[model samples]
Target: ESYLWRDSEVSRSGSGDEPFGWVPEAHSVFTERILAEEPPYPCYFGTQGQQRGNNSFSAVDTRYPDTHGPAALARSLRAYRQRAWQGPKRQTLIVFVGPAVPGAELADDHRRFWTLLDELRAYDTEPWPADVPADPSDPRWQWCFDGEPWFIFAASPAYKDRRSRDLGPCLTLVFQVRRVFEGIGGSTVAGKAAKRRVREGLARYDRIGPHPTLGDGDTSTDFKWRQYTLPDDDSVAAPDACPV
Candidate 1:
């Protein structure tokens, strides 16, 4: 069931037989919105992936917390990592989930995000990377699978005020390969400037300042999990505990 595809593999032209032309409704909505340049999407990296056709996508008809969806996600991530060394350095795998029924809430999306990660962890054939900590509380800990570290991002329909997270009416997870950060990550000048630009972009696009949980994970209390699934309004605080 070809669950994974590069951006170029999928067709926007009304053709169905092209090697990978079956684009899910949720995936189409996401790509269309993220690629939009009118006001531009808040995430600079994501927009660049779309513009350069350096992103991959997976479509799951089943809703989250379901083993079926995770299985498909596991497949996609597995296939994605298999080619990581051969692809563009900035490529990302975006998994779009279709709901069998509507009306899912923010909390539901948050729980489902971690739940899927836990399940994906169980599916890992590779051991956890020796350098990364297994504990989520560790500032250096990151979501790892296939023996590679990843910075996960989640977006759902529950996001209204945060336009960056509202990628149509589905739950979306973006698996970002950690190596893409390479020379631009950490305390580097480019990394610092990129963060500022993203924050400025968020303020203008969301009309609200960046979420407090969104940090560089440089502090002892700053865990990467806190920044994964964010609530719409900052006034409503996110739970302090890690779900996965």
Candidate 2:
């Protein structure tokens, strides 16, 4: 219902350069993000798999980061992750990606801008499919769900905006879902490894070199992901994290 109104947003630009879709590396990480940590999305997206609908999948949208992409993302992730556990479906997920935080003027303000970028990752809490990709037609893409899992999935995203202001070469993710809810996260074991993957994803930009304009490389730091069970565990003593 809500997604229908914004259906026009995810449409490919038709130009050879469709920035919102998954680039090879983004696709590479997203496809693999869940394998090690969470359940994954899209159900199935490879041409080689699935009897039918392998190349198709969807997302559920939200307008949080209206608080800002990170906050919006937090709300959406919790919302989606909740659906994965409590929705009409037995298990599921609602995933999100944070656009790059444009740098501010003041030193601390600018510092916080990049800090938010890493903090958005929520520590190694869960593997985020937020890498937003590049080439939709270039192949090497896959959904974030399992071929078989503890849930059902059919969803789409809210928007594909990636600009601090949508100014220059920014990074985004192409996420998918199904059974993404049941996967390991803060509530699950080995979730630590899942969080570790995010750092590598973000670091790729530094290794690959920044974009001509944006990708100035302020987006870095460390933070913890939110817990699902809501802190009943004694070990849940606030994750030792830094300013975002």
Candidate 3:
């Protein structure tokens, strides 16, 4: 929710340009300040990938590498290497790009986007499953994902609205963290810890009020609005080897 306003303000202020947008800028800072401080082991897939989605929000082309259009891809990749992926394990970032409401056919873009996601999930070694659907025709759905960390860059579908002129485009960044018991693995532990740290960091930003103009009419005085939540690990029962 906090990001919603931040992005809105960025769009409104003419600061929505790539890399300057709140999400991208924040992610860049995060990678440098936190991820870079303690590099993860090799075999981790760092950096970001782009996927195109249909009007119905189905992912068509999942592997539409970030390098294709916006320069965010290059910057994101640089950050991943410097911060997240040091060596030993694999780490990666997935970026999803939705169809433009203007220019090309909306339906075609949607189909292409849906297909992209399907191909990525089927082929990519990424551990998480794609949250989006395979069919582009489905309504009531905007994008796909499965509780994994996936960032979304989309323009408002409602182009007819005059406010959109100032609002520009909307950006959503999503990801998930899993909990594991002690002795499970060093890398997993590091990932979980990193996830926690990142959440806390973002929460700090939320504490401060949203950008002046964007905060108008918004009832949320608390800046610490919940954008991400930790996953439940208590679902698994303890084994005899584990102590209560």
Candidate 4:
């Protein structure tokens, strides 16, 4: 019964596609925040998908950093890759992870974050992209699944200081296909503008200022993984090793 679901499919209870009128509470609440227009979430791409019906969601019951959870996420990615480029710009896959980890801290959630990526690597069926570096220290390196490079985003209840990273209720993973960044994150003029907007919005949306590690992928010193899951505050440093 669980698979890829559209914004409309989750925005409302059910489509009458089946008799049951149901939607996961976790998915509903998360989508609600992403769709908020007043403050405007920092990630315009995610907000646009919800508004335009291009965003897809996949919900699973397995808790974060566990082996069981990656299957549903993996299935969603397989399907997502086939269609992510078909729609308008900024199409994304938002995977809502169920079962909160009791007594979880920001560090605990990060452990979940890395573990999920590690186990996910177990299910990768294709070879790593040739252009992307095998080492995570490389600026151009990104998490690849099904042979496609993706920008990984993780949020959880554990995040309290940086509200932008605190997606309430559960641990969530946002998979942004690299192609979505075609003109939005590099040296191009439009890309610079988009980046500015994100930072501007972030300053307003987050309890703290924009993170220092946050930057375009094109930057030689920026590590793609460090930006994936950030500390709740600016003082802490991201881990030096890739768990996967």
Candidate 5:
């Protein structure tokens, strides 16, 4: 099945509102020009909008009222599942990508995202009454287990600024999800193995290029243009453990 997800760039108060700002643009270009060029991956740019957490500077000033709150994001995820999984047999996946800054807003958003997932798992056994009827010509139906989906937060390498000794202009966290469940008794171990391979491959990449020193006071020539994955189960852990 085709993987569907959302991507965006965000910032704290006083930061610019442009989704394709310097940091995000650079990352986007890298993903497209460099990463996609070699692997031929499936990715496309989406809409831009203002997203503010409760305690964010934007939230305080009410500058971006259309911002998506935590609750709203959860609802959107449920709706995504309902639409993407037209039948009870189909699986749904949702990915959220952006920067992870410090503050209560970020914390609350993380909490809400996970809480919604817990709610979904609680109803695994019950029939999805809301599931839309599938065409009769569809594949045969069989019982399948719903394993816990994978969540990853990809953090940027450029963390600190050299001139002002402040946070740099580059920071991002890309969240990804694998909806289908493949466990011990499943078909092939492809799904679980694929996740493991991605994690391990990212871990190996951390020792080189952009993953190692994004803002290590090194010149641009010393910078590496490789993508790195953050090793955290929860989205909040990315910013907190960002290594400069």
Candidate 6:
């Protein structure tokens, strides 16, 4: 991922193969679309430049990696924080995760994204890096996971290659989130819980539609956030709430 397709203004490698992150210059339209989004709705981070496939750079199904890539993730998070999260007490970050790049590095990309996320705390909620757990059980995830209370959304590794089908699952998550946020105000506990959905990322156990026994939603008295906090049942399902 480090030495892959890229375009940018911030920095780049002499060979132009490596650089300091996704070149925003390449995704001008996409970035603008993301920034221009509204609440009670989520945005889709579809293919970069969206049509020609990966800016005509990589020759693979690099869509997911690019959208979910660390560089992309970091850039989007920064932008959202600066704009969306600045005034409101909080806003949900709904990423449309899918496939991308050489398969092996996929997990690594996620690890880096989460670690970078851990390293980069836009806001605070305990589990400070200064207090990184002594011995993280699964270094890939829990390592100091206590460092943060985020959980992984259940994406079918098989979800890759399905194109729009893959993105629908992404949209589904946000749809449910919008359902809660639009009706609930930030002043109440549900609203607070909705805001921190991305931060804590623990899906509620009520199980709207269906999925893992996951057993339950922010069931914790603490209202922890889960990644795919919704169910496949009618409860979690909804129309494409993204802006046209």
Best by lDDT: 1
Q: What is the lDDT of candidate 3?
A: 0.28
lDDT by residue (134-222, candidate 5, tens digit) is 22122221111132222323322332211111112223223222332323112346544444444344343333222332232222211
Provide backbone clash counts, one per model: 0, 37, 39, 0, 0, 19
Give Cα-based local distance difference scores for all models.
0.73, 0.28, 0.28, 0.72, 0.29, 0.31
Off by over 4 Å in 4: 10-23, 63-68, 216-221, 236-240
lDDT accuracy of residue 186 in candidate 6: 47
Check candidate 4 and list the clashing pairs: none
Write the residue-wise lDDT of candidate 6 on 204-243 in tens digits. 2121222333223343221112223222333322222111
Candidate 1 deviant stretches above 4 angstroms: 11-23, 63-68, 216-221, 235-240
Model 5 residue 201 distance off true place after TM-score fit, in angstroms: 3.9
Question: lDDT per residue, candidate 3, 1-244, as tens digits?
Answer: 1111121232331145432233344333323322232332111222221111101111111123443322333333334333322422222233324322345432343344334434344433334445543333322122223333333222222322211111122221222122111232324555455445433433343233222321222122111111111111112221111110
Q: What does candidate 3 score in Cα RMSD to the true structure? A: 16.6
TM-score of each: 0.85, 0.24, 0.24, 0.85, 0.33, 0.31
Model 1 alpha-carbon miss at residue 227, Å: 0.8
So what's the TM-score on candidate 2?
0.24
Off by over 4 Å in 5: 1-66, 87-178, 183-200, 208-244
Error of 1 at 100 (Å): 5.9
Q: Compared with the true structure, what per-residue lDDT tens digits does model 1 show for residues 1-244?
A: 6667776654541244332233455567888888877677887888898888888887554523453367767877888886666887888888766552378888888887787789788878899999998887676677889887888888888887888888887778888887777666647777777778887778778856787776642322246676787777775343446677
> In candidate 1, how many Å is residue 233 off?
2.3
Mind giving the per-residue lDDT tens digits that candidate 2 earns over 69-179?
A: 454444444444444445332222222222222442222322433344444455234543444222222221222221211121111121112111111222222223433
